[PDB]
Amino acid sequence: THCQENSETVALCTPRIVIGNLPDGLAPGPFHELRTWEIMEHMRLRPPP
């Protein structure tokens, strides 16, 4: 981003820490639900309790 400091506009780079901080336009909620279905399947829990 272009952060606004006091009368200057220095650039600000910061790491995304998790996968969830990716935007909706590149990683939508339905994709996350469909991925966590697979993660729930991998632990033999695709029928959840």
Partner: protein, 49 residues
């Protein structure tokens, strides 16, 4: 820690710690104890198992 001299190794733990708690899990943990003696081999294959 005598794992190689044991009767049940780490695959039994790593399957039993993630199975669902249905009765079929009890059945498959039971029938994973089939012996691989030659006489158990012919006894298994003579009944189409």
């Amino acid at each position: 820690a005598h794992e190689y001299h044991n009767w049940l190794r780490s695959p039994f733990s790593r399957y039993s710690a993630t199975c669902p708690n249905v009765l079929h899990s009890v059945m498959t943990l039971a029938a994973m104890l089939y012996k691989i003696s030659p006489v158990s081999l012919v006894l298994q294959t003579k009944a189409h198992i």
